[PDB]
C-alpha cells in the first residue's frame, strides 16, 4: 500500500451539530460525497467532502485548540513538531509555555479550519 481514494487516509473532519474539525480516519465513502470518519477518539459519524481536510499536518504558526484527551480545552499555536511512538506531536505554545500535544489533541476550531478548507477540502 501507498495511497488510496480517501478510504484509509488520516485526515481532519467536521463533527456534526456545528462542531469543530477533529482528527480522524476515513472508513468508507458513504455516498453522494459523504464519507464516514472514525475520529481518532474512536467515534464514527458521516461527513461531507466539503467538511474534510486531507493534507493537513498542522502548519507551524497555525492557531489550534489544544485538548488534553480527558477533556481539558484551551487554544494556542503550533511552534514545533515531534514524532514519538510512531505518532505525530506538536509543541503548542499555550498559556506562554511550550507543551507537547498529539494530532487528535491538536484540533482546529471551525473558524481556524476554514482557513485550510479552501485548499485541503475534498469537496
Amino acid at each position: 500500500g501507498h495511497m488510496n481514494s480517501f478510504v484509509g487516509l488520516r485526515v481532519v473532519a467536521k463533527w456534526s451539530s456545528n462542531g469543530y474539525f477533529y482528527s480522524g480516519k476515513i472508513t468508507r465513502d458513504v455516498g453522494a460525497g459523504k464519507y464516514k470518519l472514525l475520529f481518532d477518539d474512536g467515534y464514527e459519524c458521516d461527513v461531507l467532502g466539503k467538511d474534510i481536510l486531507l493534507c493537513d499536518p498542522i502548519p507551524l504558526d497555525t492557531e489550534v485548540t489544544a485538548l488534553s484527551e480527558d477533556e481539558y480545552f484551551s487554544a494556542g499555536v503550533v511552534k514545533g513538531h515531534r514524532k514519538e511512538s510512531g505518532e505525530l506531536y506538536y509543541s503548542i505554545e499555550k498559556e506562554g509555555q511550550r507543551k507537547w500535544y498529539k494530532r487528535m489533541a491538536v484540533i482546529l476550531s471551525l473558524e481556524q479550519g476554514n482557513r485550510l478548507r479552501e485548499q485541503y477540502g475534498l469537496g
Binding site: 463533527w15 456534526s16 451539530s17 456545528n18 462542531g19 469543530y20 477533529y22 477518539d41 474512536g42 485548540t65 485538548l67 484527551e69 480527558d70 477533556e71 481539558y72 480545552f73 484551551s74 487528535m104 484540533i107 476550531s109
Partner: peptide, 15 residues
C-alpha cells in the same frame, strides 16, 4: 470501555 468524552463542541465543557 474507552477513554473520556474528549471534546464535543456541540456544548461547552467548562475547563
Amino acid at each position: 470501555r474507552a477513554h473520556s468524552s474528549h471534546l464535543k463542541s456541540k456544548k461547552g465543557q467548562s475547563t
